Design a protein around this ligand. Structure first.
Ligand SMILES: Nc1ncnc2c1ncn2[C@@H]1O[C@H](COP(=O)(O)OP(=O)(O)O)[C@@H](O)[C@H]1O
Ligand SMILES: Nc1ncnc2c1ncn2[C@@H]1O[C@H](COP(=O)(O)OP(=O)(O)O)[C@@H](O)[C@H]1O
Lengths: 171, 167
């Protein structure tokens, strides 16, 4: 039984869904509680929760800075302001507060890998491209994530032990 | 000003639509009239023309051998036989002919990149990973394709730009 990308990605079997953001429908408060409740380095950005179509990746570090920088300006941006990553602001009803565009802190080119891809190949892409993270997908829809550390844990489980597969690392 | 993946991908502006196979709705005849009318090394396989969501990539040379052998097998495969790349056949009307499963020659892990990826990065990936080709997407839907030789024609165009000098 060869180990694939789906065997190493999070979430694991029967754990809560990937913590994601939408490109269009989330407010400042939504992003604020997500940051408050989680300690993940970054978050995927999708078109919507039903589509799960990937748009990009965005860092916690960067989200915090952009949201604190928006409070201080005191120019109408409030807890109920819509955050968007598209090029234009979404169509919105009257009396609604100004919008927050965060497209300039979004990595519009995250690296991707299908769930069926072997870990032998994933480990090799991480080594050769110097990736911090990689997103796992199925038929164009997002499924999970692998981070550099996840790879490092996967390799160390091979080191002290099947030992031959560890040596393939040098090749 | 900054050259992107959508700048080099095919099809271009005055070029025809991407040549694609569906995973469920192409008959053996459709795929045969595609093999004779084109010279492409391979074909992206999607879920449907509506969705354009990627399922994998399949080579021409394999399609030919596979289809050749099946017409030669007698499991009664004919011209109106549906081909599929999923693990199981789709629902079929009462009086329809046998099918041809071509899953075992589908590459399920083709390399992909977004249409907004910088060309310097696509070239970098091409060199380090030794890719023969690379598929281009926009928000999870398939837009186009870049081949190893496309990348060589792009380098050429540059050499006539300080971007050519960091490769
Ligand atoms: N957004 C996320 N949703 C669910 N799991 C995640 C997410 N981001 C990372 N993970 C997983 O949770 C664990 C910790 O991730 P993180 O703290 O971001 O980096 P690290 O793996 O270096 O500690 C890893 O197994 C990682 O794959
Ligand atoms: N399946 C395809 N559908 C549409 N265009 C393709 C397809 N395959 C390749 N192309 C494009 O048309 C040309 C065909 O190239 P191909 O014969 O596949 O290999 P090469 O580019 O090395 O000659 C290239 O410019 C490529 O970008």
């Amino acid at each position: 039984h060869k180990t694939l990308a789906m065997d190493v990605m999070k979430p694991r079997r029967n754990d809560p869904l990937l913590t994601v953001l939408t490109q269009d429908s989330m407010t400042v408060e939504d992003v604020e509680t997500i940051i408050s409740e989680t300690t993940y380095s970054g978050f995927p950005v999708v078109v919507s929760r039903e589509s799960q179509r990937l748009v990009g990746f965005v860092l916690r570090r960067d989200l915090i800075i952009s949201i604190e920088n928006a409070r201080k300006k005191q120019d109408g941006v409030v807890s109920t302001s819509i955050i968007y990553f598209t090029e234009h602001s979404p169509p919105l009803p009257p009396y609604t507060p100004p919008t927050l565009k965060l497209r300039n802190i979004l990595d519009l080119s995250p690296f991707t890998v299908t769930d069926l891809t072997p870990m032998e190949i994933v480990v090799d892409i991480f080594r050769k491209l110097g990736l911090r993270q990689c997103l796992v997908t199925h038929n164009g829809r997002l499924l999970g994530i692998i981070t550099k550390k996840d790879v490092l844990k996967h390799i160390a489980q091979m080191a002290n032990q099947l030992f031959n597969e560890f040596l393939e690392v040098l090749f």
